[PDB]
JSON list of C-alpha atoms and ligand atoms in Angstrom, two decimals:
[
{"chain": "A", "resi": 1, "resn": "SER", "atom": "CA", "xyz": [20.10, 27.79, -11.22]},
{"chain": "A", "resi": 2, "resn": "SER", "atom": "CA", "xyz": [22.43, 25.65, -7.99]},
{"chain": "A", "resi": 3, "resn": "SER", "atom": "CA", "xyz": [25.37, 23.75, -9.24]},
{"chain": "A", "resi": 4, "resn": "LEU", "atom": "CA", "xyz": [23.52, 21.06, -8.79]},
{"chain": "A", "resi": 5, "resn": "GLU", "atom": "CA", "xyz": [20.58, 22.08, -10.92]},
{"chain": "A", "resi": 6, "resn": "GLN", "atom": "CA", "xyz": [22.83, 22.74, -13.53]},
{"chain": "A", "resi": 7, "resn": "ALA", "atom": "CA", "xyz": [24.66, 19.02, -13.42]},
{"chain": "A", "resi": 8, "resn": "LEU", "atom": "CA", "xyz": [21.37, 17.71, -13.74]},
{"chain": "A", "resi": 9, "resn": "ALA", "atom": "CA", "xyz": [20.15, 19.41, -16.68]},
{"chain": "A", "resi": 10, "resn": "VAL", "atom": "CA", "xyz": [23.43, 18.17, -18.24]},
{"chain": "A", "resi": 11, "resn": "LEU", "atom": "CA", "xyz": [22.61, 14.74, -17.42]},
{"chain": "A", "resi": 12, "resn": "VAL", "atom": "CA", "xyz": [19.81, 15.91, -19.56]},
{"chain": "A", "resi": 13, "resn": "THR", "atom": "CA", "xyz": [20.92, 17.19, -22.23]},
{"chain": "A", "resi": 14, "resn": "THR", "atom": "CA", "xyz": [23.75, 14.68, -22.75]},
{"chain": "A", "resi": 15, "resn": "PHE", "atom": "CA", "xyz": [20.50, 12.12, -23.26]},
{"chain": "A", "resi": 16, "resn": "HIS", "atom": "CA", "xyz": [19.22, 14.46, -26.18]},
{"chain": "A", "resi": 17, "resn": "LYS", "atom": "CA", "xyz": [22.50, 14.63, -27.98]},
{"chain": "A", "resi": 18, "resn": "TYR", "atom": "CA", "xyz": [23.12, 11.41, -28.60]},
{"chain": "A", "resi": 19, "resn": "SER", "atom": "CA", "xyz": [19.31, 9.90, -29.08]},
{"chain": "A", "resi": 20, "resn": "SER", "atom": "CA", "xyz": [18.32, 12.82, -31.57]},
{"chain": "A", "resi": 21, "resn": "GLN", "atom": "CA", "xyz": [21.12, 11.85, -33.96]},
{"chain": "A", "resi": 22, "resn": "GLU", "atom": "CA", "xyz": [19.92, 8.50, -35.43]},
{"chain": "A", "resi": 23, "resn": "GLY", "atom": "CA", "xyz": [16.45, 6.60, -35.81]},
{"chain": "A", "resi": 24, "resn": "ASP", "atom": "CA", "xyz": [14.13, 7.30, -33.24]},
{"chain": "A", "resi": 25, "resn": "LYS", "atom": "CA", "xyz": [15.01, 11.37, -31.68]},
{"chain": "A", "resi": 26, "resn": "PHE", "atom": "CA", "xyz": [14.25, 9.86, -28.03]},
{"chain": "A", "resi": 27, "resn": "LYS", "atom": "CA", "xyz": [15.48, 6.66, -28.16]},
{"chain": "A", "resi": 28, "resn": "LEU", "atom": "CA", "xyz": [19.22, 5.85, -27.60]},
{"chain": "A", "resi": 29, "resn": "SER", "atom": "CA", "xyz": [20.49, 2.77, -30.52]},
{"chain": "A", "resi": 30, "resn": "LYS", "atom": "CA", "xyz": [23.18, 0.90, -29.61]},
{"chain": "A", "resi": 31, "resn": "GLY", "atom": "CA", "xyz": [25.32, 2.85, -32.11]},
{"chain": "A", "resi": 32, "resn": "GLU", "atom": "CA", "xyz": [24.23, 6.60, -30.16]},
{"chain": "A", "resi": 33, "resn": "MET", "atom": "CA", "xyz": [25.34, 4.74, -26.92]},
{"chain": "A", "resi": 34, "resn": "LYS", "atom": "CA", "xyz": [28.25, 3.38, -28.10]},
{"chain": "A", "resi": 35, "resn": "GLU", "atom": "CA", "xyz": [29.09, 6.96, -29.04]},
{"chain": "A", "resi": 36, "resn": "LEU", "atom": "CA", "xyz": [27.64, 8.10, -25.86]},
{"chain": "A", "resi": 37, "resn": "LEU", "atom": "CA", "xyz": [30.26, 5.65, -24.11]},
{"chain": "A", "resi": 38, "resn": "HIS", "atom": "CA", "xyz": [33.04, 6.82, -25.75]},
{"chain": "A", "resi": 39, "resn": "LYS", "atom": "CA", "xyz": [32.72, 10.67, -25.93]},
{"chain": "A", "resi": 40, "resn": "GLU", "atom": "CA", "xyz": [31.22, 10.95, -22.33]},
{"chain": "A", "resi": 41, "resn": "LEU", "atom": "CA", "xyz": [32.20, 8.42, -20.15]},
{"chain": "A", "resi": 42, "resn": "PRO", "atom": "CA", "xyz": [35.93, 7.61, -20.96]},
{"chain": "A", "resi": 43, "resn": "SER", "atom": "CA", "xyz": [37.08, 7.06, -17.42]},
{"chain": "A", "resi": 44, "resn": "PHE", "atom": "CA", "xyz": [34.81, 3.95, -17.88]},
{"chain": "A", "resi": 45, "resn": "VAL", "atom": "CA", "xyz": [35.21, 2.77, -20.93]},
{"chain": "A", "resi": 46, "resn": "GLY", "atom": "CA", "xyz": [38.46, 3.66, -22.65]},
{"chain": "A", "resi": 47, "resn": "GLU", "atom": "CA", "xyz": [39.23, 4.33, -26.45]},
{"chain": "A", "resi": 48, "resn": "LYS", "atom": "CA", "xyz": [37.43, 1.57, -27.68]},
{"chain": "A", "resi": 49, "resn": "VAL", "atom": "CA", "xyz": [33.76, 0.45, -26.84]},
{"chain": "A", "resi": 50, "resn": "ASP", "atom": "CA", "xyz": [33.93, -3.28, -26.02]},
{"chain": "A", "resi": 51, "resn": "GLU", "atom": "CA", "xyz": [31.20, -5.10, -27.86]},
{"chain": "A", "resi": 52, "resn": "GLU", "atom": "CA", "xyz": [30.19, -7.72, -26.01]},
{"chain": "A", "resi": 53, "resn": "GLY", "atom": "CA", "xyz": [29.57, -5.44, -23.12]},
{"chain": "A", "resi": 54, "resn": "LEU", "atom": "CA", "xyz": [28.07, -3.11, -24.91]},
{"chain": "A", "resi": 55, "resn": "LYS", "atom": "CA", "xyz": [25.20, -5.75, -26.12]},
{"chain": "A", "resi": 56, "resn": "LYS", "atom": "CA", "xyz": [25.13, -6.49, -22.32]},
{"chain": "A", "resi": 57, "resn": "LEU", "atom": "CA", "xyz": [24.70, -2.97, -21.23]},
{"chain": "A", "resi": 58, "resn": "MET", "atom": "CA", "xyz": [22.71, -2.29, -23.56]},
{"chain": "A", "resi": 59, "resn": "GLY", "atom": "CA", "xyz": [20.07, -5.37, -22.89]},
{"chain": "A", "resi": 60, "resn": "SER", "atom": "CA", "xyz": [20.16, -4.78, -19.56]},
{"chain": "A", "resi": 61, "resn": "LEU", "atom": "CA", "xyz": [19.24, -1.16, -19.66]},
{"chain": "A", "resi": 62, "resn": "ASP", "atom": "CA", "xyz": [16.42, -1.31, -22.26]},
{"chain": "A", "resi": 63, "resn": "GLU", "atom": "CA", "xyz": [13.50, -3.14, -20.34]},
{"chain": "A", "resi": 64, "resn": "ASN", "atom": "CA", "xyz": [10.77, -2.92, -23.02]},
{"chain": "A", "resi": 65, "resn": "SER", "atom": "CA", "xyz": [12.95, -5.12, -25.57]},
{"chain": "A", "resi": 66, "resn": "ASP", "atom": "CA", "xyz": [12.82, -2.50, -28.40]},
{"chain": "A", "resi": 67, "resn": "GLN", "atom": "CA", "xyz": [17.13, -2.87, -28.72]},
{"chain": "A", "resi": 68, "resn": "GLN", "atom": "CA", "xyz": [16.78, 0.96, -27.36]},
{"chain": "A", "resi": 69, "resn": "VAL", "atom": "CA", "xyz": [17.14, 2.95, -24.40]},
{"chain": "A", "resi": 70, "resn": "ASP", "atom": "CA", "xyz": [14.53, 5.30, -23.82]},
{"chain": "A", "resi": 71, "resn": "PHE", "atom": "CA", "xyz": [15.20, 8.38, -20.87]},
{"chain": "A", "resi": 72, "resn": "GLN", "atom": "CA", "xyz": [13.27, 6.12, -18.26]},
{"chain": "A", "resi": 73, "resn": "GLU", "atom": "CA", "xyz": [15.18, 3.37, -18.91]},
{"chain": "A", "resi": 74, "resn": "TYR", "atom": "CA", "xyz": [18.81, 6.03, -19.29]},
{"chain": "A", "resi": 75, "resn": "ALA", "atom": "CA", "xyz": [17.61, 6.71, -15.84]},
{"chain": "A", "resi": 76, "resn": "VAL", "atom": "CA", "xyz": [18.64, 3.10, -14.12]},
{"chain": "A", "resi": 77, "resn": "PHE", "atom": "CA", "xyz": [22.05, 4.03, -16.11]},
{"chain": "A", "resi": 78, "resn": "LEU", "atom": "CA", "xyz": [22.20, 7.03, -14.45]},
{"chain": "A", "resi": 79, "resn": "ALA", "atom": "CA", "xyz": [21.91, 5.68, -11.24]},
{"chain": "A", "resi": 80, "resn": "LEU", "atom": "CA", "xyz": [24.30, 3.23, -11.91]},
{"chain": "A", "resi": 81, "resn": "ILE", "atom": "CA", "xyz": [27.23, 5.72, -12.91]},
{"chain": "A", "resi": 82, "resn": "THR", "atom": "CA", "xyz": [26.19, 7.82, -10.07]},
{"chain": "A", "resi": 83, "resn": "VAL", "atom": "CA", "xyz": [27.15, 4.85, -7.58]},
{"chain": "A", "resi": 84, "resn": "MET", "atom": "CA", "xyz": [30.17, 4.41, -9.69]},
{"chain": "A", "resi": 85, "resn": "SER", "atom": "CA", "xyz": [32.02, 7.60, -9.65]},
{"chain": "A", "resi": 86, "resn": "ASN", "atom": "CA", "xyz": [31.59, 8.13, -5.90]},
{"chain": "A", "resi": 87, "resn": "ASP", "atom": "CA", "xyz": [33.49, 4.41, -5.54]},
{"chain": "A", "resi": 88, "resn": "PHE", "atom": "CA", "xyz": [35.77, 4.76, -8.02]},
{"chain": "B", "resi": 1, "resn": "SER", "atom": "CA", "xyz": [37.01, 15.24, -18.02]},
{"chain": "B", "resi": 2, "resn": "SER", "atom": "CA", "xyz": [33.77, 15.02, -20.02]},
{"chain": "B", "resi": 3, "resn": "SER", "atom": "CA", "xyz": [30.08, 17.41, -19.52]},
{"chain": "B", "resi": 4, "resn": "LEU", "atom": "CA", "xyz": [29.24, 14.23, -18.61]},
{"chain": "B", "resi": 5, "resn": "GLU", "atom": "CA", "xyz": [31.97, 12.87, -16.01]},
{"chain": "B", "resi": 6, "resn": "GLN", "atom": "CA", "xyz": [31.96, 16.88, -14.83]},
{"chain": "B", "resi": 7, "resn": "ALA", "atom": "CA", "xyz": [28.41, 16.59, -14.08]},
{"chain": "B", "resi": 8, "resn": "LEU", "atom": "CA", "xyz": [28.33, 13.39, -12.06]},
{"chain": "B", "resi": 9, "resn": "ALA", "atom": "CA", "xyz": [31.57, 14.16, -10.26]},
{"chain": "B", "resi": 10, "resn": "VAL", "atom": "CA", "xyz": [28.72, 17.59, -9.47]},
{"chain": "B", "resi": 11, "resn": "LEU", "atom": "CA", "xyz": [26.47, 15.22, -8.00]},
{"chain": "B", "resi": 12, "resn": "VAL", "atom": "CA", "xyz": [28.96, 12.96, -6.17]},
{"chain": "B", "resi": 13, "resn": "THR", "atom": "CA", "xyz": [30.72, 16.86, -4.22]},
{"chain": "B", "resi": 14, "resn": "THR", "atom": "CA", "xyz": [27.27, 17.74, -3.71]},
{"chain": "B", "resi": 15, "resn": "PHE", "atom": "CA", "xyz": [26.13, 14.48, -1.51]},
{"chain": "B", "resi": 16, "resn": "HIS", "atom": "CA", "xyz": [28.99, 14.91, 0.59]},
{"chain": "B", "resi": 17, "resn": "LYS", "atom": "CA", "xyz": [28.81, 18.29, 0.73]},
{"chain": "B", "resi": 18, "resn": "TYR", "atom": "CA", "xyz": [25.79, 18.18, 2.68]},
{"chain": "B", "resi": 19, "resn": "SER", "atom": "CA", "xyz": [25.71, 14.47, 4.44]},
{"chain": "B", "resi": 20, "resn": "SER", "atom": "CA", "xyz": [29.03, 15.53, 5.71]},
{"chain": "B", "resi": 21, "resn": "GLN", "atom": "CA", "xyz": [27.62, 18.65, 7.54]},
{"chain": "B", "resi": 22, "resn": "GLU", "atom": "CA", "xyz": [26.86, 16.11, 11.07]},
{"chain": "B", "resi": 23, "resn": "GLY", "atom": "CA", "xyz": [26.41, 12.37, 12.33]},
{"chain": "B", "resi": 24, "resn": "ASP", "atom": "CA", "xyz": [27.38, 9.90, 9.64]},
{"chain": "B", "resi": 25, "resn": "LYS", "atom": "CA", "xyz": [29.30, 11.93, 7.31]},
{"chain": "B", "resi": 26, "resn": "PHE", "atom": "CA", "xyz": [27.84, 9.66, 4.29]},
{"chain": "B", "resi": 27, "resn": "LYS", "atom": "CA", "xyz": [24.36, 9.71, 4.98]},
{"chain": "B", "resi": 28, "resn": "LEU", "atom": "CA", "xyz": [21.42, 12.81, 4.93]},
{"chain": "B", "resi": 29, "resn": "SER", "atom": "CA", "xyz": [20.00, 13.71, 7.46]},
{"chain": "B", "resi": 30, "resn": "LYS", "atom": "CA", "xyz": [16.84, 14.93, 7.82]},
{"chain": "B", "resi": 31, "resn": "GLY", "atom": "CA", "xyz": [17.91, 17.98, 8.74]},
{"chain": "B", "resi": 32, "resn": "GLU", "atom": "CA", "xyz": [21.10, 17.99, 5.99]},
{"chain": "B", "resi": 33, "resn": "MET", "atom": "CA", "xyz": [18.69, 16.94, 2.68]},
{"chain": "B", "resi": 34, "resn": "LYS", "atom": "CA", "xyz": [16.86, 19.90, 4.41]},
{"chain": "B", "resi": 35, "resn": "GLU", "atom": "CA", "xyz": [19.27, 22.34, 3.47]},
{"chain": "B", "resi": 36, "resn": "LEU", "atom": "CA", "xyz": [20.24, 20.05, 0.08]},
{"chain": "B", "resi": 37, "resn": "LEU", "atom": "CA", "xyz": [16.90, 20.59, -1.09]},
{"chain": "B", "resi": 38, "resn": "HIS", "atom": "CA", "xyz": [16.49, 24.29, -0.67]},
{"chain": "B", "resi": 39, "resn": "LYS", "atom": "CA", "xyz": [20.17, 25.34, -1.22]},
{"chain": "B", "resi": 40, "resn": "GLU", "atom": "CA", "xyz": [20.51, 22.86, -4.27]},
{"chain": "B", "resi": 41, "resn": "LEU", "atom": "CA", "xyz": [17.19, 21.91, -5.60]},
{"chain": "B", "resi": 42, "resn": "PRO", "atom": "CA", "xyz": [15.24, 25.39, -5.50]},
{"chain": "B", "resi": 43, "resn": "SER", "atom": "CA", "xyz": [13.79, 24.31, -8.77]},
{"chain": "B", "resi": 44, "resn": "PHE", "atom": "CA", "xyz": [11.97, 21.32, -7.38]},
{"chain": "B", "resi": 45, "resn": "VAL", "atom": "CA", "xyz": [11.13, 22.15, -3.68]},
{"chain": "B", "resi": 46, "resn": "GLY", "atom": "CA", "xyz": [10.94, 25.92, -4.32]},
{"chain": "B", "resi": 47, "resn": "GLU", "atom": "CA", "xyz": [11.65, 28.77, -1.45]},
{"chain": "B", "resi": 48, "resn": "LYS", "atom": "CA", "xyz": [10.59, 26.40, 1.54]},
{"chain": "B", "resi": 49, "resn": "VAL", "atom": "CA", "xyz": [11.59, 23.02, 2.07]},
{"chain": "B", "resi": 50, "resn": "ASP", "atom": "CA", "xyz": [7.58, 21.82, 3.08]},
{"chain": "B", "resi": 51, "resn": "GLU", "atom": "CA", "xyz": [7.95, 20.50, 6.93]},
{"chain": "B", "resi": 52, "resn": "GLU", "atom": "CA", "xyz": [5.05, 17.39, 5.73]},
{"chain": "B", "resi": 53, "resn": "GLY", "atom": "CA", "xyz": [6.58, 16.68, 1.93]},
{"chain": "B", "resi": 54, "resn": "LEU", "atom": "CA", "xyz": [10.56, 16.67, 4.04]},
{"chain": "B", "resi": 55, "resn": "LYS", "atom": "CA", "xyz": [9.65, 13.34, 5.99]},
{"chain": "B", "resi": 56, "resn": "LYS", "atom": "CA", "xyz": [7.24, 12.29, 2.93]},
{"chain": "B", "resi": 57, "resn": "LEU", "atom": "CA", "xyz": [10.01, 12.82, 0.45]},
{"chain": "B", "resi": 58, "resn": "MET", "atom": "CA", "xyz": [12.94, 10.91, 3.38]},
{"chain": "B", "resi": 59, "resn": "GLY", "atom": "CA", "xyz": [10.33, 8.05, 3.83]},
{"chain": "B", "resi": 60, "resn": "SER", "atom": "CA", "xyz": [10.07, 7.05, 0.46]},
{"chain": "B", "resi": 61, "resn": "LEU", "atom": "CA", "xyz": [13.60, 7.44, 0.01]},
{"chain": "B", "resi": 62, "resn": "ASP", "atom": "CA", "xyz": [14.83, 5.37, 2.88]},
{"chain": "B", "resi": 63, "resn": "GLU", "atom": "CA", "xyz": [15.20, 2.26, 1.35]},
{"chain": "B", "resi": 64, "resn": "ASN", "atom": "CA", "xyz": [16.55, 0.25, 4.32]},
{"chain": "B", "resi": 65, "resn": "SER", "atom": "CA", "xyz": [14.47, 1.81, 6.56]},
{"chain": "B", "resi": 66, "resn": "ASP", "atom": "CA", "xyz": [17.11, 4.12, 8.68]},
{"chain": "B", "resi": 67, "resn": "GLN", "atom": "CA", "xyz": [15.71, 7.59, 8.65]},
{"chain": "B", "resi": 68, "resn": "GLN", "atom": "CA", "xyz": [18.60, 8.78, 6.69]},
{"chain": "B", "resi": 69, "resn": "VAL", "atom": "CA", "xyz": [19.91, 9.33, 2.34]},
{"chain": "B", "resi": 70, "resn": "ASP", "atom": "CA", "xyz": [22.86, 7.14, 1.68]},
{"chain": "B", "resi": 71, "resn": "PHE", "atom": "CA", "xyz": [25.04, 7.62, -1.61]},
{"chain": "B", "resi": 72, "resn": "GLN", "atom": "CA", "xyz": [22.82, 4.55, -3.19]},
{"chain": "B", "resi": 73, "resn": "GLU", "atom": "CA", "xyz": [19.42, 5.92, -1.95]},
{"chain": "B", "resi": 74, "resn": "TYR", "atom": "CA", "xyz": [20.73, 9.91, -3.05]},
{"chain": "B", "resi": 75, "resn": "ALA", "atom": "CA", "xyz": [21.44, 8.55, -6.58]},
{"chain": "B", "resi": 76, "resn": "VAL", "atom": "CA", "xyz": [17.87, 6.56, -7.01]},
{"chain": "B", "resi": 77, "resn": "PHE", "atom": "CA", "xyz": [16.51, 10.17, -5.73]},
{"chain": "B", "resi": 78, "resn": "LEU", "atom": "CA", "xyz": [18.05, 12.15, -8.70]},
{"chain": "B", "resi": 79, "resn": "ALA", "atom": "CA", "xyz": [17.70, 9.86, -11.37]},
{"chain": "B", "resi": 80, "resn": "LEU", "atom": "CA", "xyz": [14.10, 10.41, -10.56]},
{"chain": "B", "resi": 81, "resn": "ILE", "atom": "CA", "xyz": [14.27, 13.44, -10.40]},
{"chain": "B", "resi": 82, "resn": "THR", "atom": "CA", "xyz": [15.95, 13.99, -13.90]},
{"chain": "B", "resi": 83, "resn": "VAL", "atom": "CA", "xyz": [13.19, 11.83, -15.65]},
{"chain": "B", "resi": 84, "resn": "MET", "atom": "CA", "xyz": [11.63, 14.55, -13.51]},
{"chain": "B", "resi": 85, "resn": "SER", "atom": "CA", "xyz": [13.30, 17.49, -15.39]},
{"chain": "B", "resi": 86, "resn": "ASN", "atom": "CA", "xyz": [13.45, 15.45, -18.89]},
{"chain": "B", "resi": 87, "resn": "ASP", "atom": "CA", "xyz": [9.46, 15.59, -18.40]},
{"chain": "B", "resi": 88, "resn": "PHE", "atom": "CA", "xyz": [9.72, 19.18, -17.56]},
{"chain": "B", "resi": 89, "resn": "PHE", "atom": "CA", "xyz": [12.26, 19.64, -20.45]},
{"chain": "B", "resi": 90, "resn": "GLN", "atom": "CA", "xyz": [10.53, 17.86, -23.03]},
{"chain": "C", "resi": 101, "resn": "CA", "atom": "CA1", "xyz": [18.14, 7.45, -31.64]},
{"chain": "C", "resi": 102, "resn": "CA", "atom": "CA1", "xyz": [13.71, 0.32, -24.72]},
{"chain": "C", "resi": 103, "resn": "CA", "atom": "CA1", "xyz": [25.19, 13.71, 8.10]},
{"chain": "C", "resi": 104, "resn": "CA", "atom": "CA1", "xyz": [18.51, 5.27, 4.48]}
]
């Protein structure tokens, strides 16, 4: 595996690491996303995940209004955080 | 750095490794993309980057019609292939 492929694999595995804990094993709940942000993106959220921001994040990603983020919906998040990592 | 932050940093450094080769240092030319595909995404392109497929890929990725792939266009490409990777994985 190339370095890029290894990195892409971590994008995949990370989603499932959090999604598979609670509820639907293939969707990220609010709570699973909060954990993902705090543990995986501390540079973006710091030590405390802001409740209102989390609600708006979830709402913007959750295109089918099931209150969860599926992997297709999560790909939008991946694109955003990739751009953010380049710029900031 | 978290495993996810380390992964994102690889996506950023990989882009610039290839984009900075020639021409605009912040955009992937068709040639730069060909190499990136060949060396970095062989599990998606394989051993040869196909020429017709390369032209189709560039066209599909190139939302601003400048015949190159910029960072945002690349970020969308990778998010699409990770949805592909997740399909293969799941
Ligand atoms: Ca879940
Ligand atoms: Ca959803
Ligand atoms: Ca270039
Ligand atoms: Ca372009």
